[model samples]
Target: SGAIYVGNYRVVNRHLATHNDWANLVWEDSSRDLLVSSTTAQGCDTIARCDCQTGVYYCSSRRKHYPVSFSKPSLIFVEASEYYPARYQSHLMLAVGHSEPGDCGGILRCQHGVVGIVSTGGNGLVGFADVRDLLWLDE
Candidate 1:
């Protein structure tokens, strides 16, 4: 229910970034050239990795998320509404689509906090306090 974190591998090209450094694979993008592995993940857990011999590419996760819980330093990259383990639909995704990857960057990091909009654009989620005035709209 918070913001999503998008972490891209400094070595890979996929915009999907995470806090982990071992199993960093490209999202919605997989290759047979690399060996793949996966683990259950919740919230924003680390992704699995695949190995490659070309050196140009290193690894890839056979799956986007593992079948784990959402308590580990999780950082989901999708919104509460996304396709995955079916259970992950419990958190917000990153906001990456516009020029930058921040608040309104996209579904990755929702603008729910209303902290500000990123050069990128997609879902500008607002914070409860930012729009607290809406509570009195009925008045």
Candidate 2:
């Protein structure tokens, strides 16, 4: 196992920018690649299946969520509630998406306290009061 701290990666911290880096990291390191992509993530809905009201899968299938984690400092990109884990069945998730005007650029920072979610669209997440307010994507 290896580790990474991306605060120094110094690429523009724009939406989805770190996804490329993660892809490269896993691709270049065979062991880590297996650890990452080899694991199957099932029972989740796609963006197309998301409901406008709940931001979850319209079919209401059960989904599993894991707290966002990083073996090393990392960032993951997702757009809107469409990428929300479990297709948005959790109340905590509903609170997050309920009043959102529209989709926002999202990132999962490996940094703690700073964890939770962020909308790169505005200066900050509009309706969320605290980072804790953004919980439940972890399920």
Candidate 3:
């Protein structure tokens, strides 16, 4: 179960392919582990693995001067990492899944950590520049 991929920016703009939208993630989520995972392609590597919960996590392709790690082609995980809470490993591996819908390249709330030329807001491990933009509340 390793299907890493998120967002639709490159896909919509004819950048990557539709199958790319289905690119898989690298790691897996267990009852208590952010297992590391990875995948290889004919050319350069094409996958990642990690141990995380059902929420938003991110890496980078261009630190953007933030002085942190970054990578090309961002990443983005969504809700329902196997549908449940505190039980299932929720192995968010990409060899088995991909990103969900509804992203706009940091346009919604200008979320940070976004890859301007390589994200779709909903893309994998990527954001729209302001993580807060993708949230909502009234309190």
Every model's TM-score = 0.17, 0.20, 0.18
Q: Listing every candidate in turn, what is its Cα RMSD in Å to the true structure after a full C-alpha superposition?
A: 18.9, 16.5, 15.3
Query: Model 3: how large is the Cα RMSD against the reference?
Result: 15.3
Candidate 2 weakest lDDT stretch, 10 residues? 53-62
- Give all candidates' CA lDDT scores: 0.21, 0.23, 0.24
Give the candidate number with the greatest lDDT.
3
Of the two candidates 1 and 3, the one with more favorable lDDT, higher being better, is: 3
* Order by TM-score, highest first: 2, 3, 1
Better of 1 and 2 by TM-score: 2
What are the per-residue Cα lDDT tens digits for candidate 1 across 53-134?
Answer: 1111101112121111112112233322221222321112122122223222121111122111111113532211011112
| Most accurate candidate by TM-score | 2
Model 2 Cα RMSD, 1 decimal: 16.5
Model 1 per-residue lDDT at 40: 41
